[PDB]
Amino acid sequence: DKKARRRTLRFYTSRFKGDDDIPYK
Amino acid sequence: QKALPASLVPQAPPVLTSKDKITKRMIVVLAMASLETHKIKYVLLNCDDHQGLLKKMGRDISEARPDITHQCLLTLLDSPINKAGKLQVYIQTSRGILIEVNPTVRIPRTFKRFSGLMVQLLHKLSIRSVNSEEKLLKVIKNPITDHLPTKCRKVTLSFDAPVIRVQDYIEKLDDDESICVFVGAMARGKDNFADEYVDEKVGLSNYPLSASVACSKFCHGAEDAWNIL
Amino acid sequence: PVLTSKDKITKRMIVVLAMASLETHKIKYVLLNCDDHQGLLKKMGRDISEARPDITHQCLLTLLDSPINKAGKLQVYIQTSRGILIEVNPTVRIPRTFKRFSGLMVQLLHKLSIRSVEKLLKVIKNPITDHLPTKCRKVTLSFDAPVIRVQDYIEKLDDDESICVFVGAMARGKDNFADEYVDEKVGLSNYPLSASVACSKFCHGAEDAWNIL
Amino acid sequence: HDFAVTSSTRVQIFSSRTRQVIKTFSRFKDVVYSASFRSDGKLLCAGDATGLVSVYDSYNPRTILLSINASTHPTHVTKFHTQDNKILATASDDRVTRLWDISNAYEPQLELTGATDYVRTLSFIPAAPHLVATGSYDGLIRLYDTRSSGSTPIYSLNHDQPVENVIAVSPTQIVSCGGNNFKVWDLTSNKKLYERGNFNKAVTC
Amino acid sequence: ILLILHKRIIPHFHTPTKLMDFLTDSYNLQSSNKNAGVVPILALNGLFELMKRFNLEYPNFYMKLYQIINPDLMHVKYRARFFRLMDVFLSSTHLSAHLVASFIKKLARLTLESPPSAIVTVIPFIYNLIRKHPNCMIMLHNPAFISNPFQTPDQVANLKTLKENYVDPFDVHESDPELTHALDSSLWELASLMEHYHPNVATLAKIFAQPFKKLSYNMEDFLDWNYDSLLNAESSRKLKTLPTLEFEAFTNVFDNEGNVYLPGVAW
Amino acid sequence: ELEQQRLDRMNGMIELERGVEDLDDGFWEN
Amino acid sequence: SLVVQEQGSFQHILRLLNTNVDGNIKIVYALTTIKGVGRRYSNLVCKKADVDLHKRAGELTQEELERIVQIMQNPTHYKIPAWFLTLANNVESKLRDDLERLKKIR
Amino acid sequence: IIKAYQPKLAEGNKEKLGKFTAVLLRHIIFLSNQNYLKNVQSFKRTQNALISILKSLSEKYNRELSEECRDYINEMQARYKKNHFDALSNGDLVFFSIIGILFSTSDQYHLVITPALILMSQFLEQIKFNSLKRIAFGAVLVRIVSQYQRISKRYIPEVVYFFQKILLTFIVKPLDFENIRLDSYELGLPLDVDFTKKRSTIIPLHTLSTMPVDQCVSVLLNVMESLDATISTVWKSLPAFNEIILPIQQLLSAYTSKYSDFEKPRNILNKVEKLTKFTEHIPLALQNHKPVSIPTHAPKYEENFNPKMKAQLKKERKFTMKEIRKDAK
């Protein structure tokens, strides 16, 4: 039973803060 | 008794923009900003770094300090009101150039990098994000008023003016309208830069206040007034 | 009257700028900086992330320029990350530009004091507690701690006492620098706050609480 | 007399003579919950899971004539008032059956409350435009007067089982089908005259 | 027979409708033999297949279903089969908040005295239900009792009176899932599970304090867990950590008949 | 120090200083 | 009280070919997000799946989605047409040399 | 052996001693399995001493000890798979106790504790506990697990389940507790039990193999003392304390009504009433989340702005192109 619905559910499934500096480059 | 919102996850409040005029917001105009570029490489003209060149330009170096402008936006941008998205920032350069500062921006803290940003904004007219999704800083068309909200109160910072409690001033004021504060980033000068647009001028403290200090005091005043926290 | 560490009876706002990244490096001694000195700090073995004396610079500007300082009710102390305690005289006026600001501290750290012809800046002996007032309340800024109204906090608090706020000027780090001296940590806003913003947030509440105006 | 069907995210209008779809309304984004026409038939209103209620011109899919966000919760029932055209009634999972107006799209004319469970049935009594009948999954059918301040039922009728649809058969008789039986109620007597329970599953419509 | 009835028996019969009276009697079996108390659990699966295939009905289905939920359910080896059917039944779009609320509160009550394997099943099972029916956030939290710093002193006084006068209205003995008043209660039981001894289980319980960003969770990733799988899983840990010690020292592990590790236990 | 290390391990500091939440990635998925 | 729809509930999100496709968007333009799948290729796949294009990506029933997977993974089997599926630096140096010679002329 | 093979004496002694650390643990467990009722004192003077030596060995040979400890846990599980309770022995109880001595019990995750705890929770549940020997085995198990959480104080559902069946087992049903699944109805205590004599609550390990009423009572008394201790420490802290203790309260009420002289349930019941009175049973609120800020995005800029190679070729062409006409003209 689960092997059947295991197939089915597979389709079903799928910020700077405070003093943080901008990314240096 | 009421049913709850379907999704309780905290969602960022909308980023305020000049196009929207209805929403209540705190505007601040950093007037008389000294942001100037000149080829040596174009460098944001500084009061101390470039004294001879500004002498050659004939402009007094005393009013050539973009650091005051930088400090104001730092405390202004990092204020809770900005992070809460009820504050948008306007800058009027002394030459006559009006700049939009998107509330989303995060400027560099170091002044040297900040000068790097300012020279570019003057040349490209705009600044784009690292991820290329929104234009953070944009120069725009004068006068300010068309960008200002349709219903709005205007005030300037005058030391000579009577001292008023900002919390009281905002509390006594209406809700549909909006508040503009005109802060003079200039080190020294007569407080008539925004006399033509303002309707009344107010003071905050008996003692002299810096531009960076004064705006920080006000944003607190709205935040306590507005229950921003 | 200019408040001083010697006087303890008077009620005042104390602000402790903890974890201050103030260091002098000679290749001549100059203040170490994140951007100006990267390779030199790498040779020293110290991570460049916590190498911002400007964050300490901005905090002094808002603190010193605050109206409460103009009311002579505020004194500032700086705890350098190296372990150096600096008393900031309320009368001092530090330069606004960061370059000149860096030029002062190399003199201070080497000369151990700055004189005008009272010591405007003076290096003092640790612990910080002895300099503090005899009856004094201590708090740190903690994002994790509950958010409080600074105004209500000062209002509910006694008058003969004094209140200490330990502000961490360091960019990113655990808020345990002042855990030894402090008796509780308080949140100021639900949201992040920069050190300059936070101490600016505190001073206004003291201004509103005591009606300094 | 073309009939409208609410299915999936679309509403389809079928020609009576041709017995085939003539208009397909696919602008609706989430599940669609209603296709009721006004008395004239020139308008038709519909509900969506997002809670937004949209009004379209019948036989003109394209134009959104009036778009109202009743609530954050789903709006399952949207019915034009039979006697009065301008007022449109909306029921939502918020358990408040707001009465909206075409002119006033920003605030309901009235917001009927008092339901402790989902309200999925809304009926207007003929000859009594002021009277509004609501049936919730509480098993209670609530009667309201719009002439009064409203927001509180005139009285409640107990069905004892979740109410799936309430229909006013005649001006004094209202038939309520809920659970496994349907019962006819007379407002003058305020009691059920008759009840038939031949059905075995729960009566729905 | 009942275990294989739904799959290996019904599809091969010519007229499977004949089995219902056997199944309904099975689904309605009540006996003094405890080992026969599991019969409705097994009979439920076959009954649902017949109802689905020919549009057949069982009276007061949910009320009977509310009765079957009991502590014994959490310990039977057939728990996983039952919940799978529960997902289908409680996915119905004509379920009232009160009806769902009762299944919620009773299950949370049962999780207090449940194996972690059952708890691992319930915690995602409940998140799906609460997500499906948004009105039931009251039971996780009711905004009326939250304290705001800005609230005036009178509001503080009023809030204090509200806290004093609260009483849990949920009844455990009512067999009608619509009347239990669960919706007015709260799920204190799930909060206790946050302190579950097993770390991974506690993290699952911690999800309720977190924003409900995720749409749903796969039940079949959660249903067939046994302790032995927990034993096999911990040994087959992706991350390996250094063992640690106890600096505290005990002179004697067991109590006699200086420092005793196990007072109340002696050799 | 053992006590401050101790309270961290009470709170999820696991010494390979990771966290228990790291251990909780893919545990149920397989 | 017990209603179960055979087709299934609306899906806000789906996973197809190791890619999260928003069930909200229409099928063609939800699948165009798939790497290597364009608007027209997605249209071709949808039509071969006998899947109505007006449908949203959320509603899809299991069998048709599996069919779509089979179509994408096995195009030739279902008769998808085949057609649907330093020197510059040297020239720069030469231009520079010509420029230098040109300066030499003057 | 340790002195003869210290690490400094020769290379390779560390592995030998580390292997010896695993060997010593099995011997400590092995001796407990052997009968020792004859010379309990001599066993006590060997048993604790060997544990002390392992404590020294563990301090340096942890990895060797931890590996062996995990192996025994797997072996214990395998034996439980085929023999069920018959696999369980005195040394098994001892083994869990030694892990507590040598390893940090109150951790969110540990290599040996986390397996060890869940093994005992297993023994707390599927074991039918239909014999006084088995009930006593569980009573020891309850004490071990309760102490592993002496600092964490985490919640173990099995302890709740274990108490209810054991508590009800000794009153057998009263017809008011159908929610608790009993595995024996013949262990109900007689009414004639005095419940005022000072009966020793300590359960010796060796008595377990030998294993009437006083033994039933002695086993029963220890269980409540574990129950009473857990209420004060763990369950009191839990938000659902009232729901946890209600079934226990009903069972404890049965003792007082049936055995008025029996004081232990009344003391627990009086205490339980005190805890419920003070605890303010208020609806929890956990979805109150801090507001989230507006997005913040860094600016994109060149550090030194300027007012691919094929493109430059085109511009240099134009400049070179442009000059040519002027000469040609």
B227 in reach of chain H (CB within 8 A): no
Report the 10 Å Cβ neighbour count for D195.
Answer: 11
Alpha-carbon Rg for chain D, nearest whole angstrom, is 17
Q: Are D83 and D40 a contacting pair, CB within 8 Å?
A: no
- Nearest Cα residue to C3 out of C112, C111, C132, C169: C132
CA dist D44 and E237 (Å) reads 60
Mutate which: D50, D72, D93, vs B, most B CBs within 10 A: D72
Q: Are C60 and C17 a contacting pair, CB within 8 Å?
A: yes
CA dist E97 and D118 (Å) reads 8
D30 in reach of chain E (CB within 8 A): no
Report the 10 Å Cβ neighbour count for G17.
Answer: 14
- Sort out which chain H residues have CB atoms less than 8 A from F14's CB and list them: 108-109
CA dist E83 and D165 (Å) reads 32
Q: Are E58 and E64 a contacting pair, CB within 8 Å?
A: yes
What angle separates helix H13-33 from helix H40-60, to the nearest 10 degrees? 150
All chains having 3 or more CB pairs closer than 8 angstroms to chain G: A, D, E, H
CA C147 to chain centre: 21
Residue C168 marked in a binding site: yes
Write the CB contacts of B32 (distance below 8 Å, at least 6 apart in sequence): B63, B92, B94, B184, B185, B186, B189, B193
- Sort out which chain A residues have CB atoms less than 8 A from C143's CB and list them: 18
**To 5 degrees, how large is the angle CA H89–CA H90–CA H93?**
100
Q: What is the 3-state secondary structure (H, E, C) of chain D?
A: CCEEEEECCEEEEECCCCCCEEEEECCCCCCECCCCECCCCCEEEECECCCEEEEEECCEEEEEEEEEECCCCCCCEEEECCCCCCEEEEECCCCCEEEEECCCCCCCCEEECCCCCCEEEEEEECCEEEEEEEEECCCEEEEEECCCCCCCCCEEEECCCCEEEEECCCCCEEEEEECCEEEEEECCCCEEEEEECCCCCCCCC
CA dist D54 and D90 (Å) reads 11
CA dist F14 and F8 (Å) reads 8
**To 5 degrees, how large is the angle CA B100–CA B104–CA B108?**
85
CA dist H253 and E132 (Å) reads 41
Task: Give the nearest chain G residue to H319 (CA atoms).
Answer: G99
Identify the three-state secondary structure at position B96. coil
Residue C127 DSSP label: P
Write the CB contacts of E81 (distance below 8 Å, at least 6 apart in sequence): E41, E42, E45
Q: Which residue has the tokens 């029932």?
A: D77
**Closest CA of chain A from C2, distance in Å:** 32
Residues of the binding site of B for S-adenosyl-L-methionine: 157, 184, 189-191, 204-209
Q: Which two tokens stand for residue H212?
A: 């009437």
The phi and psi torsions of H233 (rounded to 5 degrees) equal -100, -55
- Sort out which chain D residues have CB atoms less than 8 A from E57's CB and list them: 200-201
Identify the three-state secondary structure at position C137. strand
Q: Using a threshold of 3 CB pairs under 8 A, tell whether chains D and A touch.
A: no
| Alpha helices (runs of H) in B16-57, residue ranges in sequence order | 52-57
D9 in reach of chain G (CB within 8 A): yes
- Nearest Cα residue to E229 out of E202, E204, E200: E200
CA dist G46 and G43 (Å) reads 5
| Alpha helices (runs of H) in H130-279, residue ranges in sequence order | 132-148, 157-169, 205-210, 213-230, 241-258, 264-278
Question: Looking at the partner chain, which of H291, H299, H302 has a beta carbon nearest the beta carbon of B136?
Answer: H299
Report the 10 Å Cβ neighbour count for B80.
Answer: 24
Q: Are E130 and D171 a contacting pair, CB within 8 Å?
A: no
Q: Are E35 and E72 a contacting pair, CB within 8 Å?
A: no
Q: Are B66 and C177 a contacting pair, CB within 8 Å?
A: no
- Nearest Cα residue to H174 out of H258, H261, H264, H260: H258
C78 in reach of chain A (CB within 8 A): no
Task: Give the nearest chain C residue to E150 (CA atoms).
Answer: C149
Task: Give the nearest chain H residue to A21 (CA atoms).
Answer: H298
For residue H207, count CB atoms less than 10 angstroms from its CB and return exposed for 0-12, middle for 13-18, buried for 19 or more.
middle
The DSSP element (H or E) to which H30 belongs, if any, is helix H13-33
Residue environment code for E11-44, b if the CB has 16+ CB neighbours within 10 A, otherwise e? eeeeebeebbeebbebbeeeeeeeeebbbbbbbb
Question: Looking at the partner chain, which of G1, G10, G55 has a beta carbon nearest the beta carbon of D202?
Answer: G1
Q: Which two tokens stand for residue H132?
A: 């006084």
F23 in reach of chain H (CB within 8 A): yes
Q: Which two tokens stand for residue G12?
A: 């806000």
Q: Which long-range contacts (CB under 8 A, 24 or more apart) does E53-59 make?
A: E53/E10, E53/E16, E54/E17, E56/E17, E56/E20, E57/D200, E57/D201, E58/E24, E58/E27
Interface contact A14-G66, CB threshold 8 A: no
C-alpha torsion sign, points E106, E112, E117, E120: positive
CA dist G61 and B129 (Å) reads 41
- Sort out which chain C residues have CB atoms less than 8 A from E149's CB and list them: 147-149, 152
E134 in reach of chain C (CB within 8 A): no
The phi and psi torsions of C12 (rounded to 5 degrees) equal -160, 160
Report the 10 Å Cβ neighbour count for C68.
Answer: 22
Strand partners, D89: D79, D99
**Closest CA of chain F from H139, distance in Å:** 26
Interface contact E238-F26, CB threshold 8 A: yes
Q: Are G68 and G16 a contacting pair, CB within 8 Å?
A: yes
Q: Which two tokens stand for residue H49?
A: 């001493």
Report the 10 Å Cβ neighbour count for E112.
Answer: 24
DSSP letter string, H51-118: HHHHHHHHHH-HHHHHHHHHHHHHHHHHHHHHHGGGG--HHHHHHHHHHHHHS--S-SS-TTHHHHHH
CA dist E65 and E88 (Å) reads 13
- Taking one residue from F and the other from H, the number of pairs with CB-CB distance under 8 angstroms is 16
Residue environment code for B12-25, b if the CB has 16+ CB neighbours within 10 A, otherwise e? bbeebebeeeeebb
Report the 10 Å Cβ neighbour count for C77.
Answer: 21
DSSP letter string, H125-142: HTS---SHHHHHHHHHHH
The DSSP element (H or E) to which G96 belongs, if any, is helix G87-105
CA dist B154 and G44 (Å) reads 60
All chains having 3 or more CB pairs closer than 8 angstroms to chain A: B, C, E, G, H
- Nearest Cα residue to E211 out of H292, H282, C143: H292
Residue H298 DSSP label: P
Q: Are strands C85-88 and C74-80 parallel, antiparallel or unpaired?
A: antiparallel
Q: Which residue has the tokens 């207007």?
A: D124
Q: What is the 3-state secondary structure (H, E, C) of H203-221?
A: EEHHHHHHCCHHHHHHHHH
E224 in reach of chain A (CB within 8 A): yes
Mutate which: A17, A19, A24, vs C, most C CBs within 10 A: A19
Identify the three-state secondary structure at position B171. helix
Q: Using a threshold of 3 CB pairs under 8 A, tell whether chains A and C touch.
A: yes
C-alpha torsion sign, points E67, E68, E71, E74: negative
Q: What is the 3-state secondary structure (H, E, C) of chain E?
A: CHHHHHHHCHHHCCCHHHHHHHHHHHHCCCCCCHHHHHHHHHHHHHHHHHHHHHCCCCCCHHHHHHHHCCHHHHHCCCHHHHHHHHHHHCCCCCCCHHHHHHHHHHHHHHHCCCCHHHHHHHHHHHHHHHHHCHHHHHHHCCHHHCCCCCCCHHHHHHHHHHHHHCCCCCCCCCCCCCCCCHHHCCCHHHHHHCCECCHHHHHHHHHHHCCCCCCCCCHHHCCCCCHHHHHHHHHCCCCCCCCCCCCCCCCEEEECCCCEEEEEEEC
Interface contact H109-F23, CB threshold 8 A: yes
CA dist D29 and D74 (Å) reads 13
Task: Give the nearest chain F residue to H154 (CA atoms).
Answer: F10
CA H12 to chain centre: 36
Write the CB contacts of H151 (distance below 8 Å, at least 6 apart in sequence): F10, H106
Interface contact B12-H293, CB threshold 8 A: yes
Q: Which long-range contacts (CB under 8 A, 24 or more apart) does D2-5 make?
A: D4/D35, D4/D37, D4/D44, D5/D35
Residue C191 DSSP label: S
Identify the three-state secondary structure at position C78. strand
Report the 10 Å Cβ neighbour count for G102.
Answer: 13
Q: Which top CATH class is G13-78?
A: mainly alpha
Sheet with D163-167, strands from edge to edge, namely D163-167, D173-178, D181-186, D191-196
CA dist H77 and C152 (Å) reads 60
- Taking one residue from E and the other from F, the number of pairs with CB-CB distance under 8 angstroms is 35
Identify the three-state secondary structure at position G12. coil
Residue environment code for B31-53, b if the CB has 16+ CB neighbours within 10 A, otherwise e? bbbbbbbeeeebbbbbbeebeeb
Mutate which: B44, B71, B167, vs C, most C CBs within 10 A: B71
For residue D18, count CB atoms less than 10 angstroms from its CB and return exposed for 0-12, middle for 13-18, buried for 19 or more.
exposed
Instruction: Establish whether the linkage from the previous residue to E169 is cis, with ω within 30° of 0.
Output: no
CA dist G56 and G11 (Å) reads 9
Question: Looking at the partner chain, which of G89, G95, G105 has a beta carbon nearest the beta carbon of H316?
Answer: G95
Interface contact E211-B10, CB threshold 8 A: yes
Give chain B's count of helices (H) and strands (E).
Answer: 6, 10
Q: Are C135 and C150 a contacting pair, CB within 8 Å?
A: no
CA dist E30 and D89 (Å) reads 50
